[PDB]
Design an enzyme around this catalytic site. Structure first.
Site, PDB file in Angstrom:
ATOM      1  N   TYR A  52      18.577 -53.929  12.462  1.00 29.54           N
ATOM      2  CA  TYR A  52      19.289 -55.047  12.812  1.00 29.54           C
ATOM      3  C   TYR A  52      18.658 -56.268  12.079  1.00 29.54           C
ATOM      4  O   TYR A  52      19.107 -57.161  11.565  1.00 29.54           O
ATOM      5  CB  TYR A  52      18.889 -54.913  14.079  1.00 29.54           C
TER       6      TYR A  52
ATOM      7  N   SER B 246      18.824 -64.260  13.627  1.00 28.98           N
ATOM      8  CA  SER B 246      18.040 -63.557  14.676  1.00 28.98           C
ATOM      9  C   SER B 246      16.586 -63.723  14.570  1.00 28.98           C
ATOM     10  O   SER B 246      16.147 -63.782  13.371  1.00 28.98           O
ATOM     11  CB  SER B 246      18.341 -61.963  14.873  1.00 28.98           C
TER      12      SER B 246
END
Ligand SMILES: [Cl-]
Length: 218
Positions: A144, A131
């Protein structure tokens, strides 16, 4: 991009990037197996294995059985992942634990079950979906981003552990800057297939950020 005859495994294959990647490999001629906790969509033109990839015992059981039937694992795509947002001091215990279990633990389990195969056969390719939150701090995404930073680090060290076996190991990091519309899964899948392909044969330990330039090169 031709993957005719190649055996490809994709995690997170029930939806999202993993589904789009599994479909792209099927259309490129590969023999695809998808792994996910649920397959709740209406169409899967590939073999499906329903399990918790965060659970080391389930991954051991399924992968050992599959590896007894195949002669090569040509491509492994780690594309499992969950997004749980929150201020760091508000995030629930559950969201913290499950974020790490799925986003790091799943790939860890897959690596534990496949590294011997990659060493035996020589060669192959691994692509892991991280990500852009692993590249820059993002408010609301502390857990995250941290889980994706651990995933990236893990995948790079695995890539070093497998380099002597000829295995290429790379990452994709999805999201007038940003330039363009948010990348759809089908477009992320294109980049995964490029990194899994022979056109990338001297590329390893790289991470292509596909977010319209939002990290400004970081
Ligand atoms: Cl979810």
């Amino acid at each position: 991009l031709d993957f005719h005859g190649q055996t490809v495994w994709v995690t997170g294959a029930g939806k999202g990037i993993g589904y789009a990647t599994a479909l792209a490999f099927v259309e490129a001629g590969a023999n695809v197996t998808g792994f996910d906790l649920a397959f709740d969509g209406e169409g899967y033109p590939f073999a499906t294995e329903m399990l918790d990839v965060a659970d080391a015992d389930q991954v051991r059981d399924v992968c050992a059985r599959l590896l007894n039937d195949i002669e090569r694992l040509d491509v492994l795509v780690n594309a499992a992942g969950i997004l749980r947002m929150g201020a760091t001091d508000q995030l629930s215990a559950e969201d913290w634990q499950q974020t790490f279990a799925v986003n790091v633990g799943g790939a860890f389990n897959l690596f534990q079950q496949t590294m011997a195969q990659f060493r035996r056969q020589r060669g192959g390719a691994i692509v892991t979906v991280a990500s852009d939150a692993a590249h820059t701090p993002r408010i609301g995404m502390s857990a995250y981003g941290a889980s994706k930073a651990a995933l990236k680090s893990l995948a790079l060290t695995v890539g070093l552990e497998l380099a002597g076996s000829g295995v290429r190991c790379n990452l994709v990091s999805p999201g007038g800057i940003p330039l363009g519309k948010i990348a759809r899964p089908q477009e992320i899948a294109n980049t995964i297939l490029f990194l899994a392909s022979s056109h990338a044969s001297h590329i390893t330990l790289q991470d292509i950020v596909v977010d319209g330039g939002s990290t400004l090169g970081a």
